[PDB]
Symmetry: none
Subunit: 216 residues, 2 copies
């Protein structure tokens, strides 16, 4: 299923999120060849209650560069084009929690991951509901390990805040939807940049990401 | 069936044409944005030098890619039979010359394919068409559409103006008919406004035609 990831692929991302009773559409393209994502996300509903950094990780691991020596270690591509389910529970230290279910599939000459998010237990005038996070991101390593039992995968994000840091504990689970592949323990190193179209009246985020794999 | 036309769509076009016993094959590739009514296409005459100029073949060569504005969504025949598609038949009377008769099938294979035979009869040698006296250009037109309760589809009638190198104009009467292939949708009378530009890749040695097209709908106030 890596065949599908030779060259450029169109991307659809739709998130249905509910944070403390407060109820994003993204388009662009991804190059598994370069681990390069270019995406613009659109809130639609109104002024988002959470900052733009919290939602990103919740915003396509299959587009990551697994080097040629690491080919047989690509869970994400192997369930193609039938796809995966990605569930995460995300504990923000000293704050609330996201609980996320995602489906990552081809529904095209074009990919899609359609996602529900339910955020509960966030404190008002906390760092999250108060939008005290900077419009930026740090680099991270993605420690991946196999799950013979669930036939899939499992896997602390630093959000820059007034100079403090909010950590966000990520517990992730990935299950194939067809009958696909598992690889040994490995790590994904990331970079993401936030930007904005100053022509855009609505609340938005332009995203550029670079992710390559390493570890054995 | 509009789901399929959100964003960019790949296009395949194949023509099998016979004009006064002259057999030729044209293959076209590119993409279309129903969002912008935007077609970009390169056509290739696999067989040789085309017998007929390249401007006669453009209409015969995807009206589902026309932008119908938001008030006009329920007036989109072409979108509604997709992915199973339509048949597009035309008889084209070139005033003071010969006639094309064209049958086409427009479907998804998610690339949008229309496979077409053309048969031209009674064109006069050293007429404007067989003599290649047409300029390599196009005009803007209105595409007048009307429903067909009986044939469960569409008709359309229009006189395409082809510029002649001698300053004259060749008119070409288009009688068109569209029928669904599945069990799809119909709209009231409305009109499609068009623009097309011809260009060439100066690197390909075969003769060919690069196309950019802009088509939007209007008519219901």
């Amino acid at each position: 299923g890596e065949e599908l990831f030779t060259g450029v692929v169109p991307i659809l991302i739709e998130l249905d999120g509910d944070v403390n009773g407060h109820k994003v559409r993204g388009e662009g393209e991804g190059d598994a060849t370069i681990g390069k994502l270019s995406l613009k996300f659109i809130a639609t509903t109104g002024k988002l209650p959470v900052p733009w950094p919290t939602l990103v990780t919740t915003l396509v691991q299959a587009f990551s560069r697994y080097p040629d020596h690491m080919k047989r270690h690509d869970f994400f591509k192997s369930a193609m084009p039938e796809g995966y389910v990605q569930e995460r529970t995300i504990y923000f230290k000293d704050d609330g929690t996201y609980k996320t279910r995602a489906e990552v599939k081809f529904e095209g000459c074009t990919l899609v991951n359609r996602i529900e998010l339910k955020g509960i237990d966030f404190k008002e005038d906390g760092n999250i509901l108060g939008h005290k996070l900077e419009y930026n991101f740090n680099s991270h390593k993605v420690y991946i390990t196999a799950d013979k039992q669930n036939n899939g995968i499992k896997a602390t994000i630093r959000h820059n805040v007034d100079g403090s840091v909010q950590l966000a504990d990520h517990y992730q689970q990935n299950t194939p939807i067809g009958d696909g592949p598992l690889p040994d323990d490995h790590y994904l190193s990331t970079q993401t940049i936030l930007s904005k179209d100053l022509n855009e009246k609505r609340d938005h985020m332009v995203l550029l990401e670079y992710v390559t794999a390493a570890g054995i």
